Design a protein around this ligand. Structure first.
Ligand SMILES: Nc1nc2c(ncn2[C@@H]2O[C@H](COP(=O)(O)OP(=O)(O)OP(=O)(O)O)[C@@H](O)[C@H]2O)c(=O)[nH]1
Ligand SMILES: Nc1nc2c(ncn2[C@@H]2O[C@H](COP(=O)(O)OP(=O)(O)O)[C@@H](O)[C@H]2O)c(=O)[nH]1
Ligand SMILES: Nc1nc2c(ncn2[C@@H]2O[C@H](COP(=O)(O)OP(=O)(O)O)[C@@H](O)[C@H]2O)c(=O)[nH]1
Ligand SMILES: [Mg+2]
Lengths: 433, 6, 38, 44, 148, 426, 368
């Protein structure tokens, strides 16, 4: 009875939800019309009704409709519940103000109510999985208000975020550095830990590893879905060292403002490349510590690892896991901080990952999913805060914000909060005396 | 670019 | 024979001990009789 | 103060009636019909 | 004649019928599909990599001293902690799964002390060939037909 | 086994009884031609409750249709279930009431009542033992408000020991289509109190409300509202017709709900109502029926129970259910919000469990509630009546039919006594 | 959800809007007598943006036309309109059309800036409907006179519209002379081109894509200060009849025909100016890696001609339905401080409009 509740807010939330739930119905045998042709591991993500139908434990909420009508009219119309496909009436317009004070206020009650009806049917519910972005209006405003409206109700339960972090060199919008700082200021006091994954880094992964030119969003969303399925592999399938949802908090975050770990998936390889090289345990975890296989563009050569956690999955025995982690530890290139001499967490599942028909990945025997909490994330925050320091220096784009329930003082207080984080992230990097 | 006379 | 997680799934639905896996099984008494090892 | 509804539920307000295929309001419910679940009469 | 044959269609979702609509020279079905049709995997492939047991390569006969790869010929700790009579004096899983001639099997079964008859030996040999795909019998197979 | 005689007075009563007989023939397996095509052997033993037996194995409903014009009886004889009714049970007048209560009660609604009495004695004597009568009418009209109360005032004096039950469509606050509506609404509760044992108040606004917020029908018709109240009507006599673990007829509810002979005004409701998109996806459990069967939005009367307080509460359940989780839930709802139940009575809720759900439904439940919140319904009809009675507006239509001015004041006094009596439990 | 009320003002605004309705009824698949013809289900999905139906499925556009009028009805799609919208009481019909709407998103205006109708009547129309409905966006497509009347309209336009484009018909002639090789450019072809680029910014409203962006997302994403909303349109995949099959229809070629100067729709050289912000909305099947790469490579190498103090000047939106025939197409809108080159030419040719134009030019000048 290990239940999980997945909430996908934003368009970046719902496309990722489409890929994730496609993989989820692929893992078990859930048909798009909801039937189970093989009539136990499915109930984590699939509530069973009295007519033989398995509805998912998903809540899709977005302020503009369009991408949710695509779900209501696509190939998965009869799988999802019509009532937990919550739609708005008009757009949030890349604005924190419209997603946090004016438009999100009228519709926070329906999503809160539906989340309560979802969690009332559960018995051993583990926690929540928030799928949102940082550069959006409904992905950053409504999500940040959802977090603080969910902390009051449920409290002692895991609140884990899967975030689309803004990219280092490339970007989509202009006002994104505003409403990424302004939602990470509100996130820090109501989120247990937040995994964040970039988009340009997945572009480089698809170009450099699968030899695929010009990847569309389906590739990135499928790799994100592979991570998300590997991170909840313990509840569904029994292994040797099961790592449930509560273990992520006590093993990753040492201080409540340092709850941002990375994410990486090691055996990203094609059918042609996989036939030409062997996939042993001694090298799959060595691909995880490569700077070029990380799915966030940051360089760990000037970033100290602080908390590490792999979830092994497939034909793996614990002995070569020990024999590979041991020889990973002795190398001087990766640096751990002095006060975390353990610095590791091992989980093992007995179910190998599946392959998607018509997909890009290859069906392999062993896979890992490593969640690294590094000091190198503070490099991304520095260059991201520099954008706010430059744009706000002469009041650019402020007039769209304050006229929708925002105030001029919220920029300075979030600026000083991120300055506080940018002085907090170096005290964990000094050498003790 | 493409300029104006070009 | 029924797994515990299946027992909780069956307890979530309102099964009146005749569809429940607690009190009902598909194996008959002959399945129990010849279920030895020597 | 009541259980919050959708933004497209039928109210008393005079909206413009559209076709069943253009996605304007309450189209998700209107495209489907009422269907019987079981046709077997239970015993006592 | 039959002015209408199949052309009676439902426009939306209601129960009333409308004629069939025409379209000359503006059909855009090929060019009006969407991205969301790519996510349509609805409920063959080889599996890539080495297994840890590594039971698909042939077994070695004289084991090297530098070899680390398992093959499944090394038993678990149930075998190395509580060996059987076969294990504790030398014969293993391999010699029970080695094909034997009918002369070899006949001397096997005579030396054990069961003294099968000729027709009974033919029946045992036929059953033991029956349980194999090709007919290569083994002593394990002989014990299996002898058990019942 | 105890048969029930159905009477239909007025145009609204005729349409509502047409849909009631359609749902009854649906759940009993009767075709529009009157024969039997159901599969169960359990639909045929208790068919004497509503259907008589004719030759050839066909059934006829035990219904009487009454109107002052033949306008709606021709429409009910050409519906999907028109020919099943009996031609001799069609008693109709020539001149319409014209939405006037006085001529529907005294002048032109008084000579036709002898034929209705003759037909009611004709079919109520053929049965072995009779439980009582059901009346379907609207208080805001002239046919079912005048003649529909003269029938009540003539049935009780012949059968005093039988149950008299009415399903009255009281006027709605906003959606009112008649100007003379409060007059006929007021003059009927005058003799609707001391002359019947049970009265269910169904409002058209509340039915539209159910069709909007629950069924999500953007263009409802009168047929859907009639179907809702017909499903309610079928859910209160289910233990007479079908066996179960704990049975309860209408006499059970009359004993178990009203504490005093003058306080017999209820409010109905139907539990398993869900939207079209969320019909396959909703788990039909007893907590699901209990949560929304007590909901304010699942009320057929236009009065919020949170304004008032619940005197007695009924709950008739259908299906294969477990009765630990009806007692547990119906004590839980009493103990959660104890300020909405009167505390001078230990429990308030009566439980009845039948075994057969309606066709196409896994489980079902019907709600009957005696609340002090219904006094708001008579506090608006009264205010309109006394607002229209001061300026003597629309009074000469009544005084020319043999009515004096003071019957209005006496009816207002009885209605104020009703309102004040319901006040003392608040 | 997001409905658009279309306003045609002036003489040329009527033609521009009528052939906009040509295009919009064309790729929605609408029969000129009013009915819809049926192939796909994506055409009749979001017709509430621009159309409201009569009985029997006849779709009439939400357009009211005010000024010529008889020549519109003699056109191809001249019978698509309702006769009561021939207003020549404009406030009454537009407020009735807004009242019948579900929740209005904004207004579309087509007019001119070189006559007594678009500048006189139309700007007063904007001043009235902005005051009545202050919580919407005023999209105004404005035809400006050539730099090589206008003053009396821009000084009241700046306070109202918050979203406007200059057309510069000499740049349309430059298109049809240089990059199209058409010997006889009709006025119809020129404002067909401007209709094609004007239907290119309302694509996310009517068709699903991979990155939706309505007109309000553009309004917040290209307006940094509440008066600088003068943009500079474009439309890339335009090639000659003798160069039809000589084109590889790819993202690189589309990017080059975005950020070239002759493709743009203003009579201004962008080198004196600097691009404050850029939005390139893409239509069709683009891999997002290619759009992603070429929406910043132009910034990385051409850095002396992009503005500082904005770390990312561009905005990307991607739909899934291209126009007719073509498979990949995209539309440019962008704020540049080369717009003032037109206004310096206008100002050289009562007093408060001149002073407002001078202050606006100086406001565009100090950010450069
Ligand atoms: N990896 C990945 N990223 C996506 C996907 N869809 C959108 N994004 C990212 O989301 C960012 C913009 O998303 P949003 O601005 O939040 O769009 P939205 O969710 O509709 O929010 P609003 O635009 O404010 O309405 C872009 O920079 C993309 O990188 C996706 O399917 N996969
Ligand atoms: N719920 C419901 N109400 C009805 C129906 N038909 C009529 N009414 C109501 O009945 C009222 C008028 O009844 P009326 O025609 O005067 O009944 P009469 O006395 O027989 O003439 C109207 O206000 C309607 O709201 C129906 O089928 N269902
Ligand atoms: N679409 C279109 N635009 C035109 C046509 N004729 C002129 N124009 C444009 O209209 C502008 C001049 O209009 P204007 O003189 O202001 O019209 P006025 O307001 O009636 O005086 C020119 O720059 C042309 O670009 C036409 O037939 N079709
Ligand atoms: Mg969006």
């Amino acid at each position: 009875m290990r239940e999980c509740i997945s909430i996908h807010v934003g368009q970046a939330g719902v496309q990722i939800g489409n890929a994730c739930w496609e993989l989820y119905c692929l893992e078990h045998g859930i048909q798009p019309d909801g039937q189970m042709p093989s009539d136990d591991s499915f109930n984590t993500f699939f509530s069973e009704t009295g007519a033989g139908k398995h509805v998912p434990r998903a809540v899709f909420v977005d302020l503009e409709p369009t991408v949710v009508d695509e779900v209501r009219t696509g190939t998965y119309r009869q799988l999802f519940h019509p009532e937990q496909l919550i739609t708005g009436k008009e757009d949030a317009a890349n604005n924190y103000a419209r997603g946090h004070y004016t438009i999100g206020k009228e519709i926070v009650d329906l999503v809160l109510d539906r989340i309560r009806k979802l969690a009332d049917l559960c018995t051993g519910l583990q926690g929540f999985l928030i799928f949102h972005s940082f550069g959006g209006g409904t992905g950053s405003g409504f999500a940040s208000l959802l977090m603080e409206r969910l902390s009051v109700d449920y409290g002692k339960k895991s609140k884990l975020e899967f975030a689309i972090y803004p990219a280092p060199q490339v970007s989509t919008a202009v006002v994104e550095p505003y409403n990424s700082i302004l939602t990470t200021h509100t996130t820090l006091e109501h989120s247990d830990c937040a995994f964040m994954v970039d988009n340009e880094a997945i572009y480089d992964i698809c170009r450099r590893n699968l030899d695929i030119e010009r990847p569309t969003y389906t590739n990135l969303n499928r790799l994100i879905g592979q991570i998300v399925s590997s991170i909840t592999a313990s509840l569904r399938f029994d292994g040797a060292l099961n790592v449930d949802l509560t273990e992520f908090q006590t093993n990753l975050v040492p201080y409540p403002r340092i709850h941002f770990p990375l994410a990486t998936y090691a055996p990203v390889i094609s059918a042609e490349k996989a036939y030409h090289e062997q996939l042993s345990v001694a090298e799959i975890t060595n691909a995880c510590f490569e700077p070029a296989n990380q799915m966030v563009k940051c360089d760990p050569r000037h970033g100290k690892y602080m908390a590490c956690c792999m979830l092994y999955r497939g034909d793996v025995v614990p002995k070569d896991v020990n024999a590979a982690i041991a020889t990973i530890k002795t190398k001087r290139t990766i640096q751990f901080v002095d006060w975390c001499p353990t610095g590791f967490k091992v989980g093992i599942n007995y179910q190998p990952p599946t392959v998607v028909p018509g997909g890009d990945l290859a069906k392999v025997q062993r896979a890992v999913c490593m969640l690294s909490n590094t000091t190198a994330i503070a490099e991304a925050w520095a260059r991201l805060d520099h954008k706010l320091d430059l744009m706000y220096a002469k009041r650019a784009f402020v007039h769209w914000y304050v006229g929708e329930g925002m105030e001029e003082g919220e920029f300075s207080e979030a600026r000083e909060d991120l300055a506080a984080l940018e002085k907090d992230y170096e005290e964990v990097g000094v050498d003790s005396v | 670019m493409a300029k104006r006379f070009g | 024979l029924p797994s515990l997680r299946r027992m909780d799934m069956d307890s979530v639905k309102a099964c009146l001990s005749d569809e429940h896996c607690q009190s009902t099984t598909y194996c008959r008494k002959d399945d129990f009789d010849n279920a030895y090892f020597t | 103060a009541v259980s919050p509804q959708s933004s497209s539920t039928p109210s008393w307000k005079i909206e413009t009636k559209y076709s069943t295929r253009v996605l304007t309001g309450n189209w998700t419910e209107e495209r489907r019909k009422f269907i019987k679940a079981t046709e077997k009469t239970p015993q006592t | 004649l039959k002015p209408e044959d199949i052309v009676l269609k439902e426009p939306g979702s209601s129960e009333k019928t409308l004629r069939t609509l025409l379209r000359p020279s503006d059909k855009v079905s090929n060019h009006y599909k969407t991205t969301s049709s790519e996510i349509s995997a609805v409920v063959c492939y080889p599996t890539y990599g080495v297994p840890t047991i590594r039971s698909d390569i042939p077994a070695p006969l004289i084991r090297r001293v530098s070899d680390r790869t398992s093959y499944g010929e090394e038993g678990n700790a149930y075998s190395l902690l509580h060996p059987t009579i076969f294990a504790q004096k030398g014969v293993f899983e391999r010699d029970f799964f080695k094909t034997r001639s009918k002369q070899e099997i006949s001397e096997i079964l005579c030396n054990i002390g069961v003294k099968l008859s000729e027709d009974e030996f033919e029946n045992v040999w036929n059953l033991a060939s029956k349980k194999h795909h090709r007919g290569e019998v083994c002593v394990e197979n002989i014990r299996s037909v002898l058990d019942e | 086994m105890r048969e029930i005689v159905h009477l239909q007075a007025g145009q609204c009563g005729n349409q509502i009884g047409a849909k009631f007989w359609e749902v009854i023939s649906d759940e009993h397996g009767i075709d529009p031609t009157g024969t039997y095509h159901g599969d169960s052997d359990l639909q045929l033993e208790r068919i004497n409750v509503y259907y008589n037996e004719a030759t050839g194995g066909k059934y006829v409903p035990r219904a009487v249709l009454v109107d002052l014009e033949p306008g709606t009886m021709d429409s009910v004889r050409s519906g999907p279930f028109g020919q099943i009714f009996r031609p001799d049970n069609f008693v109709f007048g020539q001149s319409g009431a014209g939405n006037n209560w006085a001529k529907g009660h005294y002048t032109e609604g008084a000579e036709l009542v002898d034929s209705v009495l003759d037909v009611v004695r004709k079919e109520a004597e053929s049965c072995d033992c009779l439980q009582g009568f059901q009346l379907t009418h609207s208080l805001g009209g002239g046919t079912g408000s005048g003649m529909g109360t003269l029938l009540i005032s003539k049935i009780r004096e012949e059968y005093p020991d039988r149950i008299m039950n009415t399903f009255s469509v009281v006027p709605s606050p906003k959606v009112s289509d008649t100007v003379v509506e409060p007059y006929n609404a007021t003059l009927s509760v005058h003799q609707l109190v001391e002359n019947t044992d049970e009265t269910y108040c169904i409002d058209n606004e509340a039915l539209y409300d159910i069709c909007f917020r629950t069924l999500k029908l953007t263009t409802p018709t009168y047929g859907d509202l009639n179907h809702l109240v017909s499903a309610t009507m079928s859910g209160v006599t289910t233990c007479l017709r079908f066996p179960g673990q704990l049975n309860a007829d209408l006499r059970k509810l009359a004993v178990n709900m009203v504490p005093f002979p003058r306080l017999h005004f209820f409010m109905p409701g139907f539990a398993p109502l869900t939207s079209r998109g969320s019909q396959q996806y909703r788990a039909l459990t007893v907590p699901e029926l209990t949560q929304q069967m007590f909901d304010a939005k699942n009320m057929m009367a236009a009065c919020d129970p949170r304004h008032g307080r619940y005197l007695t509460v009924a709950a008739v359940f259908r299906g294969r259910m477990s009765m630990k989780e009806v007692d547990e839930q119906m004590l839980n709802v009493q103990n959660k919000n104890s300020s909405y139940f009167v505390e001078w009575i230990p429990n308030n809720v009566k439980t009845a469990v039948c075994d057969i759900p309606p066709r196409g439904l896994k489980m079902s439940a019907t709600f009957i509630g005696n609340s002090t919140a219904i006094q708001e319904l008579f506090k608006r009809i009264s205010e309109q009546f006394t607002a229209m009675f001061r300026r003597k507006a629309f009074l000469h239509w009544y005084t020319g039919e043999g009515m004096d001015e003071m019957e209005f004041t006496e009816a207002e006094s009885n209605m104020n006594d009703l309102v004040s009596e319901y006040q003392q439990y608040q």
